Design a protein around this ligand. Structure first.
Ligand code: ATP
Ligand code: ATP
Ligand code: ATP
Ligand code: ATP
Ligand code: ATP
Ligand code: ATP
Ligand code: MG
Ligand code: MG
Ligand code: MG
Ligand code: MG
Ligand code: MG
Ligand code: MG
Lengths: 298, 295, 300, 300, 296, 280
């Protein structure tokens, strides 16, 4: 493989490998080919992720559905083994408008599911040489089969799994065909899940969409959903006991996404802490509803 | 790839071919045929038979009478060239209708050897490596006389006429298609193709797949059969279950869509039993299925 | 190829890395791969930029809002460490009509801030080789993580972060996806902030606009803003004490952007020194700028 | 490095020939090295020997030529004369606009000959490339090379197509090309004495952000009665005219709406029909031009 | 590029190149790029054209003006090298109503003149890849400069030189801009002449129209002009000695173009040879044969 | 190797030497070969003078160049236009022309020419004309040329304007075609451009059928059908039909037989009364 092979990269690959055999002692005496070692640099261990499922608000019906049909069937196959129809999905699509916690769910998936996480990107798959892109995808599925409870995550999956056409490069179409064959094809994988997140679900190819049968629509938050998101965002922050009305802010932030509320919480936090920060810089305060409505527009 | 696990796999795959047919003991393979041997699929790996594919009995019988039986006993199919096994069989249709399931059943429930290459095992950085791999692939097909060279996703496998295509795949275009023309002599080896976009396959390259097997979206009666095989090994109830209603309700559903519908309905039906065991499976009514569909 | 091994480029990369280690001694002993070394040619040190925050007029509320909400939370995290919502923005967009001072703010951000500045141009990112652009962006985010207080500035960001469509090329569709994943994905970045300037905010994709939560509108100058911009532009320039009236010019420059006032000052100063230039050109005292030369280049 | 463009034997010979002329004109460029992309821009270098047209060959436009000299040429090529004030700098871009045929290309050819600046008459064929990201690198090298040859002029004839108004329906590479051109033109890490002179007959098609990058605008409008006579006299220079019958003033009167190119064709027809008797004698084996020769083509 | 890389094209490109060497031996030492080689497929040698200037009727004043103002200044610079204004035009527009012989004049220009004729079409210019059409146009002008006595002919030029708009395609807009820059720009073309035939002159851009200063109006034939067109078309035909009245047919064809008269002769020839056609499957012309198909 | 090309080589052995490119191969898919259609010149009713004129002015000058080599003005026309009210059988004429005339029919529509990329439509048209030049006796039929050869203006799209100009250039330009002939079957002759109407100088007016023409059409369409001797009168049906196209009589003859059939199906016949029961 004429990719990676850097001093930082090879140190990263060994560092993740010593982590993986530490989480699972059965991963010892498992030989990985050279292409599979380059995939190991994309392994995300739970200590890297600082996001807990409790840090995602307003998605508890979706989180419970994520645990009931995706996490527990994969990570606990001993209790779903009474019938062959209680298996994990071949793929999961965390689609929806931008702002809603699709990557929050994937980060919590990387931390609390317990499965090995491969947060692979296009830079680790695309290679300038002829057959290296295909052998990377072959190794990515092969390594995920060796680490049997694995989740392969491709953020912004609408670009990797875009609709096939005559515009497609010779490598990309062959790359997509190789991904299709290993995903749901001959010589089926073990407990390997391809979890994806995207803003444009319709940009994904129909043959790739059929390989993501469990689709989670993380839509824009409602009035109650925004209140739960604002509560988790404003946790570990001193709010006013009487001069704070979180319900009013939730109703006024109609159409606000999760990231929009975070910036609103951020902008209101520096607005509230303007006096304290200026005093500290020259050398806090309970957050009120007037601070949020100052940056708001009703 | 002569890389430890690859070497172990090729030796193990060759060992499996020995017990499958002891006539191959005297046959010797070189290095490039050995690197193709890692793609050999044996029926022990596949767990999908022809009885696992519902809603496809006319196509399965047509598959047997055109590609399977003419290969296994060509003596009785040599009366006419039409009854002989074609050198190219294409399984095409909308995705999720069982093209791969037919390939899984072809690998398992057939006495022929089953080469299952991917495009990763063929393309290589070094010049001439891809041509020698393809040449050894057809040579290995001649050595294993009842062989099937299965190519999933034919659309990207050397089936494209574009100026952006490289010269390495341009000579791979000719090398594969010249050896394909030589496959019509013996007739005991075919190339089986699976695809969901027949428009991407080149018309000048499609003629070398004369046998076409259209696996369309399931009909009302076909979805009834597919729902039946998907729900086997799962215990049901006999009074409050009407699987006929689900078959008509799932309009436009593919086989993969029904498998997800069956899987999701089974999880919701077993939710109470899973909750007990996490910290007997409840009967599967038609209410769980009809909750998932739009009607 | 990596399109970074040019003789001038390699000397530029070594020179920029020497300045980065000189500014931040902790940047030594770190390891830079081949792709990350090419991004070093896009590093902008404060000695390159000659433009200060004091050289931007009319945007004092915006400059103050830039300091308290963007610069100070990023470069002084210990002041902002008491609350977890006091962090620097993951993205900053300086949008508005052209010629109003978005690059002026970006120049002062490069100079008057301790953050390492990566003013990456798009010729460095896109490459003819397959998958080279994705690794370059991955290296650009990787390098910005090594230089922990960092600013990745992309001028005219509406072309990079354009609204995604099926007509987009595969290399850019993966390039935008790679940029999106590293901007806000699983591997959360450190003090990396991506700052953008554009005239077409609506051309930016919705998923990319959400990655630029802090947005500064550098709109067309008002009557008071035009006077402040004219005063800054006419600094180090002799103006007449009685005949010159900056208030009349500022009110008469309705709809004038900051760049339009610079050209108006450029024409007015050229005609003011035309007699002096003709005397100097024949051989090879600047006349003070009055209101008449500014108004004769202007429309009432 | 190195695009498919500027790789032929003819092109490589042109780049080498253009570089020797540049080194001969400016001896300081001998030590200057260039990247493979900057070499391809060298084929677009226009030396004064390639242009046979001077400012004295442009009839009319004398206030425009003087304004071109005092505000564009002299502040650029004589920075020491204009170094007294910082506002006496040369403009970042020049736009010669107006109806076609009035002499915008005449001014650029005269600018290419007797301004003293290195001239890069780039075209869209030299900029656009079929490979991904090469057009951005070509534009980047175009600004890079123009910075090496410090008093440079990058001339883009018909600039309304290169700098067209940006839209969501614009091409992926073209919108990327315009953003890259915008960043290098007026962005951080500003250029030196690089000038971007543009000539077009559709000013309103130019983008607003590109039009603000062309602050010095010259309107080469349709010639007036006195301007038509000055163009007519220059066109009829080195041509025999009748001492009594010819009346140049009268012909200029009944050429209302005639551009400079229309007068050239009128002169071409009048000179050809006056010499037809001489042409017949020469072909088988010129009287002075009169007023009736011009009026037989003119409409009264 | 890739358009001029197919074996049929390269065979034509090679064949067209040698025909220039026999016609002009000085072109043997001139080398060409890949883009320049593609344009060579549009080179029209005089052997391809079977129409001379003698085959054009009713346009003798225009042909004489065509020779005096277009052909001779371009092909005899030494004859005209006494005044700077005695030069070939930068462009020639053969505009008028259809059928009057604008393309026939270009055919005679291709045959009865030694100028290399690049009869480029819009399909040879436009390419699906980015910037290839601009490089093709650059090669088209550069090859014509390497073939110094040259004529670049674009038939139906109103589409190529259409009025520029903000709604124009980006590649088309840059194609027109690249064409205008090379047609009249900093780099002066050497004896390169662009001739165009069109019906919608007003659809041509004003900046493109100034690059076609010499304009020939090939209008509908008059009563006198219809006589020569009829006579030239009816050549190599027995006609009649006393039963033929060409003046009567010419006067009865008001509003008839050359194409209309050509098919009028074609229908009359079929009716006159109607008896001989039946005999051959198993005659002198008459005025009644022409008046039968005519509508008076 | 394509199915159309082997049949073309089998009919004309000289086509084996001729090499084709990709766009010509794309044009090859629209080649109309006489075996897959069954429309016959003798199945055309009421147009026998038009049949004779079409034959003698189109087929024999184009298919028999040895016969017409005596005079330079006996050549085939550049184009042929079949225009008139709809339903009179212009498509019938084109299909029968494809059958009996052995010229390699190229029946393209306004769908194969259009491509989503820049320049591929003009290249497709150029390859269509080049393939027509290669298959020297040929007819390029374009149904509904009012869509293709619409009158030019300043408001047309750039792709369509370039397509029309490039088609005009190949139709009659410097490079003269061989025995290449183009047929358009339109309903509106005024919608065609003046220059495009010029390139179709052989106009054939397929007008509304007259009484004699209506009688011939009714006689032809009633083939393989049982008609009464004295109870059935085709002259009365022909006279009663006023302003009726050939397709209307196809609808009439099918339905009039059906009305006689349904009373015959009820038993398990066709008279002038049965024809005029629905005919008003
Ligand atoms: N439901 C939520 N609850 C709490 N915080 C949230 C929620 N949704 C978003 N956020 C906050 O906003 C940020 C936005 O990132 P997020 O994971 O939502 O991206 P996304 O919308 O999935 O991304 P993409 O733009 O690729 O679609 C999160 O990191 C988190 O801080
Ligand atoms: N006819 C069928 N009978 C039973 N199950 C089926 C059938 N078709 C599909 N399925 C179910 O759906 C799954 C997906 O089918 P499969 O992979 O064979 O589809 P495909 O048509 O080959 O897809 P693709 O074109 O996307 O590669 C199967 O593994 C099986 O569970
Ligand atoms: N507020 C201002 N104060 C002083 N000078 C200004 C101001 N705004 C603009 N200028 C002048 O105009 C130029 C700044 O243009 P700049 O590149 O920042 O524009 P922009 O608004 O970012 O637009 P664009 O995106 O088109 O580049 C400088 O030369 C500067 O002298
Ligand atoms: N002012 C002028 N004085 C003298 N000659 C002129 C003048 N304007 C035009 N001409 C003559 O007409 C020709 C056409 O002028 P030129 O090419 O400069 O036009 P332009 O205004 O740049 O138009 P376009 O927009 O078509 O490029 C010149 O080459 C020159 O011979
Ligand atoms: N002056 C003429 N003498 C003889 N025949 C003529 C003359 N003008 C036209 N014709 C006949 O009519 C035809 C006109 O075709 P031509 O291509 O020359 O027309 P055009 O005027 O250029 O129009 P278009 O724009 O429609 O192509 C000629 O091919 C020829 O048969
Ligand atoms: N003259 C005719 N003789 C016999 N049958 C005819 C005649 N005209 C029409 N028909 C019948 O009616 C059908 C419709 O006619 P056809 O489509 O050929 O007419 P058209 O004028 O070309 O139509 P359109 O303008 O609508 O395309 C024919 O297929 C045929 O069955
Ligand atoms: Mg995300
Ligand atoms: Mg499959
Ligand atoms: Mg700017
Ligand atoms: Mg010009
Ligand atoms: Mg013509
Ligand atoms: Mg029809």
């Amino acid at each position: 493989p004429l990719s990676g092979k850097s001093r930082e990269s090879k140190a990263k690959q060994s560092l993740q490998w010593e982590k993986l055999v530490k989480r699972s002692p059965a991963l010892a005496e498992v030989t990985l080919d050279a292409y599979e070692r380059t995939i190991l640099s994309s392994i995300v261990t739970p200590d890297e992720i600082n996001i807990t499922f409790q840090d995602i608000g307003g998605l508890d019906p979706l989180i419970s559905d994520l645990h009931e049909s995706v996490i527990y069937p994969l990570m606990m196959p001993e209790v779903y083994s009474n019938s062959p129809l209680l298996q994990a999905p071949s793929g999961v699509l965390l689609y929806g408008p931008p702002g809603c916690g699709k990557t929050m769910l994937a980060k919590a998936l990387a931390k609390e599911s317990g499965a090995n996480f491969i947060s692979i990107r296009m830079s680790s798959i695309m290679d300038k040489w002829y057959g290296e892109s295909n052998k990377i995808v072959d190794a990515m599925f092969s390594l995920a089969n060796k680490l049997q409870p694995c989740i392969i995550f491709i953020d912004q999956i609408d670009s990797f799994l875009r609709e096939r056409s005559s515009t497609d490069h010779e490598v990309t179409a062959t790359l997509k065909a190789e991904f299709m064959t290993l995903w749901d094809g001959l010589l089926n994988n073990g407990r390997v899940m391809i979890i994806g997140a995207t803003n444009r679900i319709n940009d994904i190819d129909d043959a790739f969409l059929r390989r993501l049968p469990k689709r989670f629509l993380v839509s824009l938050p409602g009035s109650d959903q925004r209140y739960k998101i604002l509560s988790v965002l404003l946790k570990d922050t001193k709010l006013d006991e009487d001069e704070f009305d979180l319900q009013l802010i939730a109703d006024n932030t109609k159409g606000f996404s999760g990231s929009d509320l975070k910036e609103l919480c951020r902008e209101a936090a520096l607005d509230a802490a303007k006096e304290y920060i200026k005093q500290k810089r020259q050398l806090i305060r309970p957050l009120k509803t007037k601070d949020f409505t100052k940056k708001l527009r009703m």
